[PDB]
Design a protein around this ligand. Structure first.
Ligand SMILES: Cc1ncc(COP(=O)(O)O)c(CN)c1O
Ligand SMILES: Cc1ncc(COP(=O)(O)O)c(CN)c1O
Ligand SMILES: N[C@@H](CCC(=O)O)C(=O)O
Ligand SMILES: N[C@@H](CCC(=O)O)C(=O)O
Lengths: 404, 402
């Protein structure tokens, strides 16, 4: 009848909205090029799928420990040691139904009403809303495509207040594909250390989707940052396990125990089947081994195809991504254009709608990520689909003019 | 250094004791585990094969947030065929287990300061989910001599302008009580008078029901459809606990809010599990012969425990009409002192007594809002239950009743 004010004012995830719009259009017989959700074209690796199948076959279908099965949490600690140089005990790991839930629980457990959550823009669409679910206050810090959308520490200093409680860092980034260098992280950490109440939420789900010579640095590995950092990772992106629903949190014992307690009242311990598939995934070796190296090579090739293709287009500004499977494309020079049969294109929403309604390409408008000057394309899908999309994007813009 | 709501949040005592027992068994200490309400049946063969086929066929991608279309239409068919309810597929939201379904429902409709009415004994998570919404749980006690069923007078006595949600769990966890249609009807007439008061109807144990008892969906009563949120799922009926799959059905506007919320919380339920769910609903009305065998087994175990534990001096038992739990009144022994343990004067010290000294894990009633009882799950083998009964008798023997 009359929804709670928090849920009433909650913004829908535009990523979910557009993806489900595209899926529904396709299913009703309208072909749509789907570049919204970051969903790999690859199958789950054979050995991972076999582990899940074997779990079902051997009756591994009962409730697990809330925090996750012992074998998985131990494998996760081995991963964090070997890949990230971090030391956790198995009771500092909380396994959830994907990283989105891992993130939400972390926010809810450490943020009190009125606490400020500091979020660099462009940001993954759910960070601001999860903060509002906690009665917290999002503090967005804009970044510049000229600075590869990386947080400027001076801007961080200028936004700190007594109410500052949580800084969210996403690297490699969704939507920009930026990778934070160690040097910049070390500077940010020095700011964090001077403020006793300040925690860092480090979202590292795209860790293995990284292109040489970029390298990934876990924020929790920096000086004084271990006791301050909640580390969220998962299986969706690296191992093409999006439909399995499996992610995890690692951090200080007292915070992980509060998240676990919260998870005990909001869900039971992730799927028993997915957790077994998870230990097979981690069994693949350091950084997912050659299984993941093959997927990364493919993503890197799709990346290069897109940067070349769209980059050449008049007015288009691109930050060449260093990780993840997203291009955050600046088409803002086209804003103000009048497209025949459609109308005014003056922001990312109307541009994305134009691409979708007239050329059947589904992308996510930058405004959902806190930056209206850009559009997000996922290149997790096939090269064939990406080539088709580029031809249509070219056609789509041929009628409009780029400002100078 | 934690949020006030998570700081004060009570841990699920069912989850705590269950995990405790499993760990003990791992350290090499045998425990009779009667805590978690978990079927000993395998996932049914056709259901498991559907999950296997889903994986083999590459159905390992993100689904529609609200749930795959095939599952949501199958759920609507089931709600019509079994419960007499008419929902459209976009009135269904599929989640990672029913636990999540109840939470999102509570968060969506309860504003701060709103009151959530919860008949005691209650399933442990209802009060805590209410507090996550900044709502106030209003608990209405019930009595074993009344089969732990709500008194309509007591309900109407507790209503305020702030009453927003009433939670009806039938068949009940922890009591196994089943709400008769006539009681439900009288509750409805009280409800149909307060325009803010919604009903959350948790029907997860609907198929675990013992004749001549029968399940009545609250949403089927006159004028209640528009105010009822129906929560159900697969874990109890189809023994799919390991799978995490549940759903909510309700008014389009509330379901849309829950889906919007889930889109920020967890996204869609697993693709694999939803495929298995389609197969489970494919077994036919009430799960067909597959579920019939399960119910028959549970009824047998129930009858064994009720008879065994019943003739113990100072043990009182409401014989359950559904679910897989016994809510047993051992309070005649409160005030006893056991040599080697100490004073036993509430459900927590008695449950701890049973576990520490006799290695039987049960969940104390205090977690369910009623300290006079202890909950036993009997979704395990007859041989395990025989052992539990001997150990319980032996534990009670040194003690004295009334
Ligand atoms: C940065 C970020 N964090 C977390 C998630 C959630 O992923 P999932 O719930 O599928 O594990 C996503 C989804 N792509 C993401 O991009
Ligand atoms: C009354 C009730 N509702 C919901 C649940 C949650 O079940 P699940 O999340 O596994 O579907 C349970 C678990 N037995 C329950 O007892
Ligand atoms: N932002 C991701 C997924 C968002 C989500 O999980 O809701 C796409 O691609
Ligand atoms: N209390 C239910 C399970 C749900 C829970 O763990 O809280 C039985 O067992």
């Amino acid at each position: 009848m009359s929804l709670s004010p928090r849920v009433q004012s909650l913004k829908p995830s535009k990523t979910m909205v557009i993806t489900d719009l595209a899926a529904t259009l396709v299913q009703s017989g309208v072909p749509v090029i789907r570049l919204a959700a970051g969903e790999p074209d690859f199958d789950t690796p054979k050995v991972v799928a076999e582990a899940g199948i074997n779990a079902i076959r051997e009756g591994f279908t009962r409730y697990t420990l809330n925090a996750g099965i012992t074998e998985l949490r131990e494998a996760i600690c081995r991963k964090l040691k070997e890949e990230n140089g971090l030391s956790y005990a198995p009771d500092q790991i909380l396994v959830s139904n994907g990283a989105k839930q891992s993130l939400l629980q972390a926010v809810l457990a450490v943020c009190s009403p009125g606490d400020e959550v500091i979020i660099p823009a462009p940001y993954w669409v759910s960070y601001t809303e999860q903060a509002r679910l906690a009665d917290a206050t999002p503090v967005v810090i804009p970044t510049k495509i000229s600075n590869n959308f990386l947080l400027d520490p001076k801007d961080l200093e200028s936004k700190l207040t007594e109410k500052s409680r949580l800084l969210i860092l996403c690297s490699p980034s969704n939507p920009t594909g930026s990778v934070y260098p160690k040097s910049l992280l070390e500077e940010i950490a020095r700011i964090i250390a001077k403020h006793p109440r300040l925690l860092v939420l480090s979202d590292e789900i795209y860790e293995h989707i990284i292109y040489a010579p970029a390298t990934h640095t876990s924020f929790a590995s920096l000086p004084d940052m271990y006791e301050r950092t909640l580390t969220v990772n998962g299986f969706s992106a690296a191992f093409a396990m999006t439909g399995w629903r499996l992610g995890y949190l690692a951090g200080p014992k007292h915070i992980v125990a509060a998240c676990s307690k919260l998870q005990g009242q909001v869900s039971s311990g992730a799927s028993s089947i997915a957790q077994k598939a998870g230990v097979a995934a981690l069994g693949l070796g350091k950084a997912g081994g050659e299984t993941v190296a093959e997927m990364v090579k493919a993503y890197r090739e799709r990346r290069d195809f897109l940067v070349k293709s769209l980059g050449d287009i008049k007015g288009v500004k691109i930050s060449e991504p260093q990780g993840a499977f997203y291009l955050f494309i600046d088409f803002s020079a086209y804003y103000g254009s009048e497209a025949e049969g459609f109308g005014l294109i003056n922001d990312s929403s109307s541009l994305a709608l134009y691409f979708l309604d007239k050329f059947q390409v589904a992308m996510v408008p930058g405004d959902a990520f806190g930056d209206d000057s850009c559009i997000r394309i996922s290149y997790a899908t096939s090269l064939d689909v990406l080539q088709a999309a580029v031809e249509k994007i070219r056609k789509a813009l041929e009628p409009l003019r780029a400002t100078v």
